[PDB]
From a paper:
ASFV AP endonuclease ([name]) catalyzes DNA cleavage reaction at the abasic site and is a key enzyme of ASFV base excision repair (BER) system. [name] belongs to the class II AP endonuclease family; it mainly catalyzes DNA cleavage reaction at the 5′ side of abasic site (AP), generating 3′-OH group and 5′-deoxyribose phosphate (dRP). [name] is of α/β fold in nature; the β-strands form one β-barrel in the center, surrounded by α-helices at the outer side. [name] possesses many unique structural features, including one narrower nucleotide-binding pocket at the active site, the C16–C20 disulfide bond-containing region, and histidine-rich loop.
To unravel the molecular basis underlying substrate binding and cleavage by [name], we performed crystallographic studies and solved two complex structures of [name], [name]/DNA-1, and [name]/DNA-2. Both DNA-1 (5′-GCAGCGTCCFCGACGAGG-3′ and 3′-CGTCGCAGGGGCTGCTCC-5′) and DNA-2 (5′-GCAGCGTCACCGACGAAA-3′ and 3′-CGTCGCAGGGGCTGCTCC-5′) are 18-bp dsDNAs, containing one abasic site and one A:G mispair in the middle, respectively. In the [name]/DNA-2 structure, each DNA was bound by two [name] molecules, but the DNA did not interact with any R1 residues. Cys16 could undergo subtle conformational changes, whereas the conformation of the neighboring α-turn and Cys20 of R1 were well fixed in [name]/DNA-1 and [name]/DNA-2 complexes. As revealed by our [name]/DNA-2 structure, [name] has no NIR activity against A:G mispair. The in vitro DNA cleavage assays showed that [name] had no NIR activity against any regular mispairs embedded in the middle of the substrates. [name] does not recognize and cleave the mispairs embedded in the middle of the DNA duplex, but it is able to remove the nucleotides (either paired or mispaired) from the 3′ end or nick site of the DNAs in the absence of abasic sites. Rather than substrate-bound or product-bound state, structural superposition suggested that our [name]/DNA-2 complex may represent one product-releasing state.
Numbering used by the authors:
A (entry chain A), B (entry chain C): -2 to 40, 41A, 42 to 296
Write the structure that this text describes.
DNA sequence: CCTCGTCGGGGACGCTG
DNA sequence: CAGCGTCACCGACGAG
């Protein structure tokens, strides 16, 4: 197999109005159907199992059982984005760490392959401190997502900072820790990835530290951005419709995105499209454009 | 007689170099002599009897006796500008109100006809509340000077606010309260008085509330301004040398200043020229220019 | 139970009448 | 003392 492409599945916008106990499983079912209809069978997906605005578990025991069968039936590589309250490097991180411990156990329970956590603009020593309090579970790897700020030293969007972080992780013998790369986050953090060569040099530098972070522990969030490079604002957009790759609307194979797609296919990485909008028709309209553009890129 | 013109007499820049014995009286003598020399006998004067940077009485009992004889000898109309600490409507409204009682009693002791107090950017009732705490002394009237601010609500530079303020004063029947109009203060407070008619309508509006504030209790600070209209900055300048009446350097009888002089001559008001320069040579140079300009205006 | 950014109001400051 | 300009800080507010 090559790359494993997919999108973020909102419970609201994908679950059938008449679900009762297995709502998350139903949202996946319609999501899988949508891909087969548009001619792009998905191999990956991202969902919420909690929050994301409150540290509360959303899934139900009925949904757990049927979700595992749904994932195995369609051979899906699924991660769960943690709630926005998941910051192990905080003051009262005793509740938070236990809450993440719960999410990790559920992911193993239902066949989800990881949990995405946001990185703070904090020194790497504090990050591993919070990570040290988390006892891991097998089969589930914590993915650390690239943050987005403006006037903070620690951005974790340059390779020098990513290496230094994961070097401390490897020196601490911390198991099952990965990296999630959000193109919009590193772009709103100062890293210009518009042209093929600029994304090339960045990805080449990522490959140069594979001993610290191997591509087996790397996933991608393929997002365009409706903001400026270095602004520090998270405003996702559909591919080639935001300020990163809008200029490459009719030369898509010269864009920094195609260089990312080449990396994803080369290292068989997961790629998630996190874009949310007001309506189901609006979302499936944008998703049809993006995934048909990927279909042409993989043709 | 007509108007009573004069200037502010610093008891340093006018007293004999290194004065010790009766300095305020000596400063007046040279000030009177300076007028006789330049051909402009002064009828008014303004001095400090305290501060203005510290709540301490500067005059001495020796100076008191000779100053009274000096004032009567030349028939001078003298006021004392209060220190910058004189705010009866403040937190320390117990100490300040007693300090003013001291200054007020000294003015009667030496023949000074009033004390100038600055108005705050405060509601008018706090002002009369503070003024009600002051037991008056006869023959001495408290003159309230117009302030200078940009963003505060209360400017006391438009006639609508002056009227309600002094209306509040008359309704409380507290005696011996006057008004001091600083052309530079009301100008840096938003009131353009550059042209003859603009000063005309403002002074005309002052005459319209003569039942509330009679011209017998009105004095003037004739200052140009080295700032912009409405800036909120107190920067005095010589007449026709600042940003108010510089445009009327060779058409002085078409300026708003001449309209003020007409008012002063009409109601026999005192007019004080407050100039802060560097040396005695700098000050007496600027004063000769202004007072000779007034000499031509009164010809 | 988290953080980003922005925006807009509050107080601190070393001036100057 | 009470003005101003300047500006950082705290506290709301939508984000994701
Ligand atoms: Zn995220
Ligand atoms: Zn993301
Ligand atoms: Zn994002
Ligand atoms: Zn004054
Ligand atoms: Zn004045
Ligand atoms: Zn002034």
């Amino acid at each position: 197999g090559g790359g494993m492409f997919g999108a973020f599945v909102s419970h609201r916008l994908w679950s059938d109005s008449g679900c009762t106990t297995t709502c998350i499983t139903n949202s996946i079912a319609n999501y899988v159907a949508f891909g087969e209809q548009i001619g792009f069978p998905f191999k990956s997906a991202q969902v919420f199992i909690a929050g994301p605005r409150k540290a509360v578990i959303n899934i139900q025991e009925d949904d757990k059982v049927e979700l595992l069968k749904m994932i195995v039936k369609h051979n899906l590589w699924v991660v769960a984005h943690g709630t926005y309250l998941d910051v192990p490097w905080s003051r009262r991180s005793a509740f938070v760490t236990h809450f993440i411990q719960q999410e990790l156990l559920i992911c193993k329970e239902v066949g989800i392959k990881g949990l995405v956590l946001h990185l703070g603009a904090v020194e790497p020593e504090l990050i591993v401190e919070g990570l040290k309090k988390i006892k891991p579970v097998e089969g589930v790897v914590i993915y650390l997502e690239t943050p987005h700020n403006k006037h903070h030293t620690y951005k974790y969007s340059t390779m020098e900072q990513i290496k230094e972080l994961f070097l401390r992780i490897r020196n601490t013998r911390l198991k099952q820790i990965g990296l999630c790369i959000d193109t919009a986050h590193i772009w709103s953090s100062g890293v210009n990835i518009s042209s093929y060569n600029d994304a090339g040099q960045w990805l080449r530098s990522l490959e140069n530290i594979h001993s610290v972070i191997p591509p087996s522990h790397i996933m991608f969030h393929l997002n365009d951005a409706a903001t400026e490079c270095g602004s520090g604002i998270d405003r996702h957009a559909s591919l080639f419709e935001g300020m990163i790759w809008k200029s490459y609307s009719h030369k898509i194979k010269q864009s920094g995105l195609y260089c990312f797609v080449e990396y994803i296919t080369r290292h068989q990485c997961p790629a998630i499209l996190e874009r949310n909008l007001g309506s189901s028709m609006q979302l499936q309209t944008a998703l049809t454009a993006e995934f048909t553009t990927l279909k042409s890129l993989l043709k």
